Design a protein around this ligand. Sequence first.
Ligand code: CLA
Ligand code: CLA
Ligand code: CLA
Ligand code: CLA
Ligand code: BCR
Ligand code: PQN
Ligand code: SF4
Ligand code: SF4
Ligand code: SF4
Lengths: 50, 69, 139, 73, 73, 739, 39, 141, 80
Amino acid sequence: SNQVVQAYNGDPFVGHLSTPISDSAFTRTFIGNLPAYRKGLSPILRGLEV
Amino acid sequence: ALNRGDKVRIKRTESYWYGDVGTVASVEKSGILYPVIVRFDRVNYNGFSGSASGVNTNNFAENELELVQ
Amino acid sequence: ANLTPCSENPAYLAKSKNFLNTTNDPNSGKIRAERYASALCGPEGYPHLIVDGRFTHAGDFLIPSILFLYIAGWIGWVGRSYLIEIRESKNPEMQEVVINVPLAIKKMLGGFLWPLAAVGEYTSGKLVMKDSEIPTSPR
Amino acid sequence: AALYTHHQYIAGFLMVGAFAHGAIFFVRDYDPVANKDNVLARMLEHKEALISHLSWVSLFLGFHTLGLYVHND
Amino acid sequence: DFLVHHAIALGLHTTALILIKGALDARGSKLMPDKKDFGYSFPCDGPGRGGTCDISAWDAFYLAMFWMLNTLG
Amino acid sequence: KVSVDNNPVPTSFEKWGKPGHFDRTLARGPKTTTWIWNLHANAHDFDSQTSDLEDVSRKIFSAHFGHLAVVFVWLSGMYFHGAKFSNYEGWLADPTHIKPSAQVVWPIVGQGILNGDVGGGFHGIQITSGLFYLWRASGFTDSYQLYCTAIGGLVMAALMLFAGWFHYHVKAPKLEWFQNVESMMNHHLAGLLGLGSLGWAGHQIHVSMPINKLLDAGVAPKDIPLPHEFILEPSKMAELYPSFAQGLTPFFTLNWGVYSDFLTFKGGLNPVTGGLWLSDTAHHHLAIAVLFIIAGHMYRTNWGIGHSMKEILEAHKGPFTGEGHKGLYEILTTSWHAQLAINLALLGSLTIIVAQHMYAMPPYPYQAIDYATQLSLFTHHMWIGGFLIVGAGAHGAIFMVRDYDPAKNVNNLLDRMLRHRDAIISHLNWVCIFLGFHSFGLYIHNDTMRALGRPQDMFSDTAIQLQPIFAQWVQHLHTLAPGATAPNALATASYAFGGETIAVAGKVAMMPITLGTADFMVHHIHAFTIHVTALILLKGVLYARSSRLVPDKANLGFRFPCDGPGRGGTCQVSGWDHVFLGLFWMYNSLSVVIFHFSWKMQSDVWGTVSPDGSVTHVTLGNFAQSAITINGWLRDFLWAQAANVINSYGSALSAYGIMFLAGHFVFAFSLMFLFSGRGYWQELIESIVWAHNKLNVAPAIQPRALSIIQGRAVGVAHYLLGGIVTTWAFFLARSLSIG
Amino acid sequence: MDGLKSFLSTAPVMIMALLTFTAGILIEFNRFYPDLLFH
Amino acid sequence: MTELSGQPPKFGGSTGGLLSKANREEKYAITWTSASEQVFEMPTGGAAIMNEGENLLYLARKEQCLALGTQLRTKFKPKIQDYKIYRVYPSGEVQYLHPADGVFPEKVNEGREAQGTKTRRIGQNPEPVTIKFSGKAPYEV
Amino acid sequence: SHSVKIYDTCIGCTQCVRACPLDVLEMVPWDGCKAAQIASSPRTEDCVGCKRCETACPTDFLSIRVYLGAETTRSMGLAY
Ligand code: CLA
Ligand code: CLA
Ligand code: CLA
Ligand code: CLA
Ligand SMILES: CC1=C(/C=C/C(C)=C/C=C/C(C)=C\C=C\C=C(C)\C=C\C=C(C)\C=C\C2=C(C)CCCC2(C)C)C(C)(C)CCC1
Ligand SMILES: CC1=C(C/C=C(\C)CCC[C@H](C)CCC[C@H](C)CCCC(C)C)C(=O)c2ccccc2C1=O
Ligand code: SF4
Ligand code: SF4
Ligand code: SF4
C-alpha cells in the first residue's frame, strides 16, 4: 500500500518498526556501510577508521 | 464441643483477634482440621489497599479457644 | 528570684507607655499595662511566669492548670461514656458516623460530674479492663 | 563549635545504631523458650503499653512546644 | 532555653518512640507475626492487608534516622 | 432536537442521612475508618457509580450548575466587599497615591494591626488581586453599582441552583441531547463566546470608553455622568467622539472608515493611565465577536449546510498515520474523560497565556504601576494553568484505563501512538537529560568558575556569552513591525519588545526587556522542566494500559498503589502515581518560572523614574551578571528580597511573616506522609487501639491508617500547599514593601 | 424532614457546629476580657 | 508439544514486543483456536486482529502470555478456553508450560501432587535461633 | 526463585489460584477441609513474588506465604 512505516523485517512481534528513519533504503545503505558495520574488513581497520 | 452462638475468647497467638471475643456461627463435621466457624464484629486487615472493610468469619480449631459464654 | 517585678522595672515602664490596642476598646493597652504590673519580668521587659508550684505565683500556672484539667476531663468523659452507651443499640457504626444528638446533648450536659464518676468507675472495675480479656498483639 | 557539633552528630548516630542492633537482636538472636519470664520477655509482653506511652509523651511535648512557639510568634 | 530544652526532649522521645517500636515489633505484630522469618530488612508484604509499606524494623530505623538528624539540628 | 425525560429522580432529604449510598461497597456500613476517606475519594467518581452514559451525563450537567452557583456567590462576595468594606470611591478620587484595600479586619486578639494605613485615612488590608483596576476599566463609579451587581450575582447564584435542581429532578435531558456535539460546539462558539464578546464590545463602546475618557481628562468623582445618561442623551456621547453623530447608518453600508476615531488600532499603552486603550479593546472585542460568530456557523445541525466532524476526522489520513483519525469522533462523544483531558490541557495553556499576556500588555488602568497587582496576577494565573495541565495528564490516563475500548479504534492515531510508546518516551527522556545537563550544568559550571576565582571562564556576558539570537531577532521584528508589517498600527504590540519607557506616576509601567545570556539559561531551564513534566504525564498516559514490567495494569484500575514487591518492586507504577510525581514537577517548574518573572521584572523593568530620563530599578540591575549562578539566585534573590518578609513585624505586612513560616511548616509536614509507608503507622495505630482497649474507649469504627494512595495524596497536597503559601507570602510582602 | 435531622447530626456538621460554638465563646470571652496572660 | 502450528495474527508491528532476550535466552508463544475474526488488545501494546482458526503469537514474558489468556477467557462472549502457552528456547526445543496437566489449575483433578505444602500454621514456625548457622531458612526447615 | 509455601490453614476457597497471573498455584486434592482441596505451588520458578495471592485469602494471617528468596530473569520480570 501507500503506508511508509511497517513491521521490522516482516514479523510484527519484534519490538521495532521498519521506518524511513530506521529501515529506509538510505539508512541501511549508510549505516550498513559505516566502518563498524560494513562487511569484508578486519576489526583493526574498522577500529582505525572509527 | 461448642454451641451455635456462644461467646468464646481466641488463643490463636498469630491472628488479628487474639483475646477478642467471638460468636461461634457453626461447628462443622469432624475429621477436618479447623471446624469451628467463629464470627467477630471487628474486621481484620484484609483485602486490597483502600478497601472499605475486611472479613470477620474464620475457621478455628478446638484446643485454641477458651469458652466464656 | 533575680527578676525584677513589673511595678518598678525601667524597661517595662518604658515599654508600657506605648502598648498597642488589641481590641476595639481604645484603652485596652493601658488596662493591660496595669494588669501585667503584678507579674515579674527579666531584663527585657516581658512578663515571665514562675511555675515552680509556689502558691504566690499559682495564678501564673496552677489556676488555669486545674481549670483545663476540668474541661479536658469533661470532654474525655463525654467522649467515653457515650461510646459505652452506643456499644449496642442495633449497630454502633452508623451511630458513630451520624450522631445520636439527644444522647450526645445528654452526655454533654451531664459531664460535669466527671471526677467523682471517674473514681466510681475506677472502684467498680468498669474503667480499666483486665490484662487478659484485652485484644493484645502477638509477641 | 566544630568539635561540639561533631561529637553530638557522632552520639546521635551511635544511639540510633544501638537501637538498630537491638532490633536485629530481636529478629535473629532472641529465643523466648530460654529467656522465659525474665526482664526481656516481660519487656516484650507489654510493648503496647511502652510505645503507647511514648506516643503520649511525644504528643504531650509536641502539641504544646509548637503551641507555645506559634502563640509567641 | 525552657522551650528549646522541651524541644530536645521532644526529639529524644520521638526518636526513642520509633526505635523502641522498631525493636519491640521486630518479631511481629497484628499485621505480620512472621517478621522473624522474613529477616531484618525487607521491602513490604505487598498491597494486601491494607498495604504494608515500611513494615520492617529496618524501616523504623529509616524514619528514626530523619529524627536523629532533626533533633541534632 | 431536544430530548428530555420528565422526573427521573425524586427530590427527598432522606438520602442525605445515609452517606455513601452512591457506591455499592460504601452503603453497606462503615466497618472501618478508611470508608470515610473512600466516601470522599468516590464522591465525584460518577463513572464508577453509574455505567449507562445517561445518568452520569445529567449528573455532570447538574454538577456544573452547582459549581456555577459557587462561582457566582464568590463573584458576589467580591463585588459586595468592593461595595461595603472597601475604598473604591476613595481610590477613584486619587489612584496614583493611595492604595486599594477591600477587606477590614475585626480587632479581637491584636489583629487590628493588619488594618494598615492604605491612604486617605481608610484602614484595612491592601488587596493584591487588582480587581479595582478591572472595575475602573469596566466603568464603575460609586459603591451602589457594586452593591447592586453583588445582589444580581446572588440572584443568578440562586437561579443556577434552581436550574440544577430542575435539570436533575424535574426535566433532565437524554443522552442524544448531550451527544449533539456539533450543536454544542457552534452554540458555544457563537452564542456564548462571540455573543458575549459582542456584549462586552457594546459595553466598552457605551460605558467603558466615555467614562474612562473623561476620567483621563481629570473629572473628579461625584461629577461623572451616570452610565445610562450617555444613552439617554446621545449629545453627551457625541461631544466626546465625532463619529457618534453619524449614527448606525455608516455601519450597514460598510462605511466603517468614519468610525476610525473611536475604534482605533493604537496599541502599546495609554501614557496617561498606564493601561491599554479602551477604544483599542472595544475594537478588539468587536473583532473577536465577529470572528467567533462567523466560526459559530461551521457545523451542521438541522439545515444541511455545515461540517459534521465525522468526515472531517475521516479525511485526515496520511502515509505515516495509517487510518488517521478514524474512530476519534466515536471516542470523544462517548467518554467524558477524554473531553476533560483535552479541555484541561487547553484551559491550562490558556491560563498560562493569560498570565504571559497580562504583564507586557497591561489591559487595566493603573495596573502596571501597582507592582503587587501585576506580580500576584501573573503568578496566580501561572499556578492555575499548571494545575489544569497536570489534570489533563490525569484524565488522559483515566480515559486509558476505564474508557478505552481497543476493538473500536484499530490502526487509528490512538492505537498507533500506543504501539510505539517506547519510541516516544525513550526520546522524551533523552531530551530531558540533554536539557538537564545543558541548563543546570551551565549553572553549576559558572557557579564553580565564580567560586574558583576565575570569572573569565564563566557563562556571563563578559565571559563566554550564550547570546539568545532568535528571540533578539524576534524583538527586532516586533520593534520594526508598526509601519512595515503593521502599517495601521501606531505603537507596537507591547513595549516589552522594544520602544520607549512608559512612566505614569513616578513609576515604570513597561520598558523594553533585553535578553542577555541569563535569559538564555533560564529559558532553557524552563524548557527542561516543561519537558520533564510532559514526560511523567505522557508516560502516565501511554503506560496506563500495560507494559513489560506489569502487563495487567488495565484490570488493576487507574488508582492502585502497586502490584507488589516482586519484579524488584512495583510501587508507584499506576497512572495515578505519574500524576503524583507530575504535581511536584509542576510545582518546581512554575516556581522557577515565577522566580524568573519576579527577578527580571524587578531588576530590568520596574523601579522609580526620574525626570531626566534615567531609570533606577528595584534591585539595581542584578539579573545581568548575578542571575547565572545558583549562589546568585540564593544570595541576591532569595536572601536579599526575603528581608521584606522577615523584618515586617508590628506593621501591616505582619500576616505574611506568619504565613511564610506557616508554608514552611506545611512543606515539612508533607515530608512525613511522603517519606514513610503505611505499615509502620498501622503497626503504631494498633498499639493506640490497645491503649484505648485498656480503658474501654476503643471505638467500634475500626481505626486504621490511611491507604498508600491516600498517603501519597496527602503528601503531595501538603507539599504543594506549603510551597505555594510560602511563595505567596514572599511575593506579596516583597512587592507590597517596594510599592 | 425526617432526613434533615439526620444530616444535621452527621459527624462533620456536628463537629463544625461544636467548633463554631467553641470559637464563638472563645472570641466573645477574648473581646470582653482581652489580654489575659495569667490570673 | 514440540511443534507450534499456527498463523500470526494481523498486526502492524510495535516497539514493546520481542527484544534481544528472545533470540538469546528464551521467549514464549501462545496458541489458541478462535471462532471469528475479532479484535484483541495484546499486552505488548495496541490492538490486533485475531485470525480465524488456530493462531500463534510470540511474546517475551510469561506474564504477558497469562495476561492474554485472562483476556481470552473473560473479555469475549465466545469464551476461548483452549489456549496453550509454550516456552520456546533459541536451541529450538519447545516446553509445554500451561495448562500442561490438561485441565485448568482453578479446579481440582486427580494426578497432581502437593508440592510446597506445610503441615503447620504460621504461628507454629520455628525460631531463627535454633537454626542460626545451619544455612537454611526459618520457613524451609 | 522465590518460595511459595502453603500452610494447612487453607480452606480450599481457590481464590489465590485464580488471582495469581502466572500459573504457579493449582488445586490438588486433600482431606482436611470442607472443600477437600488445597492449593499447591509446583512451578515456583515462574513466580515473580508479586504477592497477589496474599491479597485474596480469607484466613487470619493468610495461609499462603511468598518468601522472597533469590532472583533470576523470570523472578525479576525482565523482557530484555
Ligand atoms: C514539621 C513537620 C512534622 C511535624 C509537625 C510532625 C509531627 C509529628 N510526628 Mg512526624 N515526621 C516528620 C515531620 C513532622 N512530624 C518527618 C519529616 C518524618 C520522617 C518521615 C516524620 C516521622 C515521624 C514518625 C516516624 C513518627 C512521627 C510522629 C509524629 C507525631 C508525634 C510527635 C510530636 O511532636 O507530637 C505532636 C506534635 C505536633 C506538632 C502535632 C500538632 C500538629 C498540628 C499543629 C495540630 C493542629 C491541628 C490542625 C491545625 C488541624 C488542621 C486543620 C486543617 C484541615 C484546616 C507528631 C504529630 C509519631 C507519631 O505520630 O506517633 C506518636 C511517629 O511515630 N513522625
Ligand atoms: C473522646 C474520645 C477519646 C478519648 C477518651 C481518648 C483518650 C485517650 N487517647 Mg485518644 N484519640 C481520640 C479520641 C479519644 N481519645 C481521637 C478521635 C483520636 C484521633 C485524632 C485520638 C488519637 C490519639 C492518639 C494518637 C493517642 C491518643 C491517646 C490517648 C490516651 C491518652 C490521653 C491523650 O493523649 O488524649 C489526647 C487526645 C488526643 C491527642 C486526640 C483527641 C482529640 C479529640 C478532639 C478529642 C475529642 C474526640 C471526639 C470528637 C469527642 C467525642 C464526643 C462525643 C459526644 C461525640 C487516652 C486514653 C494516646 C495514647 O495512646 O496514650 C497511651 C496517643 O498516643 N489518642
Ligand atoms: C475540570 C476539572 C476537574 C474535574 C471535573 C475533575 C474530576 C475528577 N477527578 Mg480530577 N483533577 C483535576 C481537575 C479536575 N478533576 C486537576 C486539575 C488535577 C491535578 C491536580 C486532578 C487530579 C486528580 C487525581 C489525582 C484524581 C482525580 C480524580 C477525579 C474524579 C473523582 C474526583 C474525586 O473523587 O475527588 C473528590 C474530591 C476531593 C477528594 C477533594 C480534594 C481536596 C483537595 C485535595 C484539597 C484542596 C486544597 C485546598 C484548595 C486548600 C484549602 C484547604 C485547607 C488548607 C483549608 C473526577 C472525575 C480521581 C479519579 O478519577 O480516581 C479514579 C483521582 O484519583 N483528579
Ligand atoms: C535536587 C534533586 C534532584 C535532582 C538533581 C534530580 C535530577 C533528575 N531527575 Mg528528579 N526528582 C527529584 C529531585 C531531583 N531530581 C524529586 C524530589 C522528585 C520527586 C517528585 C523527582 C522526580 C523525578 C522524575 C519523576 C523524573 C526525574 C528525572 C530526573 C533527571 C532528569 C534529567 C536531567 O536533569 O539531566 C541530568 C541532570 C543532573 C544529573 C543534574 C546535573 C548535575 C551535574 C551536571 C552532573 C554531575 C557532574 C559530574 C557527573 C560529576 C562527576 C563527579 C564524579 C566523582 C562522579 C535528573 C537526573 C527524570 C528522569 O530520570 O528521566 C529523564 C524523571 O522522569 N526526577
Ligand atoms: C503539681 C505541679 C507539678 C507536678 C506534677 C507532677 C509531678 C505530675 C505527675 C504526674 C503523674 C505521676 C501522673 C500519673 C498518672 C498515672 C495514671 C495512671 C493516670 C491516670 C489516667 C487515666 C486512667 C485516665 C483516665 C481518664 C480520665 C481521668 C478522664 C478522661 C477519660 C480518661 C479515660 C482519659 C509541676 C512540677 C509540673 C508544676 C507545678 C505543679
Ligand atoms: C502519619 C501517617 C499516617 C497516619 C495518618 C493518620 C492517622 C491520619 C490522621 C487524621 C487525623 C484524624 C486528623 C484529621 C485530618 C484533618 C485535620 C481533618 C479536619 C478536621 C477539622 C476541619 C476539624 C498514614 O496512614 C500514612 C500512610 C501512608 C504513608 C504515610 C502515612 C503517614 O505518614
Ligand atoms: S507500594 Fe508499598 S507494598 Fe507496594 S511495592 Fe512499594 S513498598 Fe511494596
Ligand atoms: S486463597 Fe488461601 S484459603 Fe483460598 S485456596 Fe488459596 S491458600 Fe487456601
Ligand atoms: S507471588 Fe504472585 S506469582 Fe507468586 S504465587 Fe503469589 S500471586 Fe502467584
